[PDB]
Design a protein around this ligand. Structure first.
Ligand SMILES: C[C@@]1(O)OC[C@H](O)C1(O)O
Length: 326
């Protein structure tokens, strides 16, 4: 069996680390993972990668989507060619994939982002419980499924728990997963909103780009609070240089491996339904959940379509970041 493992883009540390995990585990499990993507985060590029993998006779795809709508037709065609379709990281329409391996619910992840920001704000001498904290979100793009679901839940949480906070840029800032653009956009936020208190960077490119922008402006964690999601090796130097205090992620290597395992398990002829408990060798037992764990409006009618959730997420600071190497 070959699983084609497709990232939102290659050459970003989150996706490279996820593939390192998929490669390590699939070698032990006895199947091939073909890592295929593009340097740009582009739905049209992902369609081309999907089509080429189908044409080459891949048995399965495990995809993290930059835009669900833009890959729907290609994934329907993949399934009609006999290819098992799964997702990880950022989902698509659940009617066109079997299992999604997700890092957490949008409520969990949106609240985690806000809580990291709250903690870092308090540590630089603000009173986030009461202050009119000025903030905004900086991430990849306005349509991707994962990051927008977190923004929606994080905004609901802020408006409920911290009504005094002020979103100074409600349209959000977008840097398209382009490393150089994330720096430039990070600089734009700090120039146009120079008194901003918190920038929530729920994207693995926006977070290091925003930290670099702050460093370019001579700022440290004492001036402005930046938090978000990124693999820890990409942020250690910024943290050692005092640019930010705290950010988060989860075990993206095991996540990529799990997504590829689910694709292999189904492509090998095993049926998977919501409620099943599946023993993934050397990882543990997972439970397939209904699609509505990621969106309460999701249709749960098809029990062959479901979600596996990672059991934990990770908050990094200078005190634990050196325990990790990805
Ligand atoms: C790590 C992350 O926030 O940035 C890129 C990934 O797709 C992600 O999980 O959204």
């Amino acid at each position: 069996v070959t699983v084609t493992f497709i990232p939102k883009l290659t050459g970003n540390a989150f996706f490279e680390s996820a593939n390192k995990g998929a490669q390590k585990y699939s070698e032990q499990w006895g199947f091939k993972v073909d890592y295929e993507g593009d340097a740009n985060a582009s739905a049209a590029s992902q369609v081309s990668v999907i089509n080429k993998a189908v044409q080459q006779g891949t048995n399965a795809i495990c995809l993290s989507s930059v835009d669900a709508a833009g890959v729907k037709d290609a994934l329907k065609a993949a399934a009609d060619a006999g290819v098992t379709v799964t997702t990880w990281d950022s989902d698509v329409d659940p009617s066109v994939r079997k299992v999604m391996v997700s890092q957490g619910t949008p409520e969990q992840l949106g609240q985690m982002l806000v809580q990291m920001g709250y903690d870092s704000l308090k540590e630089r001498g603000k009173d986030p419980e009461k202050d009119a904290i000025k903030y905004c979100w900086h991430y990849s793009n306005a349509t991707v499924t994962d990051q927008n679901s977190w923004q929606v839940e994080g905004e609901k949480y802020i408006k409920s728990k911290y009504p005094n906070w002020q979103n100074v840029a409600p349209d959000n800032y977008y840097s398209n997963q382009d490393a150089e653009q994330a720096i430039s956009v990070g600089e734009s936020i700090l120039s146009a909103h120079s008194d901003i208190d918190l920038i929530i960077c729920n994207d693995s490119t926006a977070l290091p780009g925003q930290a670099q922008a702050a460093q370019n402006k001579g700022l440290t964690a004492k001036n402005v609070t930046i938090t978000g999601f990124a693999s820890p090796n990409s942020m250690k130097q910024y943290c050692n240089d005092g640019i930010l205090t705290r950010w988060g992620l989860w075990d993206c290597g095991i996540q990529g491996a799990m997504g590829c395992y689910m694709a292999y398990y189904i492509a090998s002829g095993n049926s998977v339904k919501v409620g099943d408990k599946i023993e993934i060798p050397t990882v543990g037992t997972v439970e397939v959940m209904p699609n509505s764990v990621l969106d309460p409006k999701a249709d749960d009618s098809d029990t062959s379509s479901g979600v596996v959730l990672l059991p934990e997420r990770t908050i990094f600071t200078k005190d634990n970041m050196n325990n990790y190497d990805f």
